[PDB]
Chains A and B, each alone.
Chain A
Amino acid sequence: LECSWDELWNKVQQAQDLDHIIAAHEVFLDTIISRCLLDSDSRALLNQLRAVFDQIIELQN
């Protein structure tokens, strides 16, 4: 999240056009989703992470 957000902000500050800014921010957001397992392709990874979090919450309780 933090790295993709910083990349988005840097790209927007370095953007040469509005379409370049849009594309750079979209790519940053997609990267954040994938690495945070929030993209469509990481859905299996996201499910495994969610199951780990649920088991951690069960252990906590």
Chain B
Amino acid sequence: NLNAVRETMDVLLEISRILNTGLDMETLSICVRLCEQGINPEALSSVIKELRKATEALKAAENMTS
């Protein structure tokens, strides 16, 4: 049920906001879909963390080059 999926995404976003995870609704829904496909949650979290670290390093490099 589309409403149940939307409620699940809103719950995930509210948890992220309480936890100040900085995840938007789309990224949360993508992570949920990937977990439903049987992706290991620790692996998914490690990938997300690595992508975040890479983005922070890129932004820091640009801010040192700007």
- A and B touching (Cβ–Cβ under 8 A): no
Q: Which residues of B contact A (CB under 8 A)?
A: none
Q: Which residues of A contact B (CB under 8 A)?
A: none
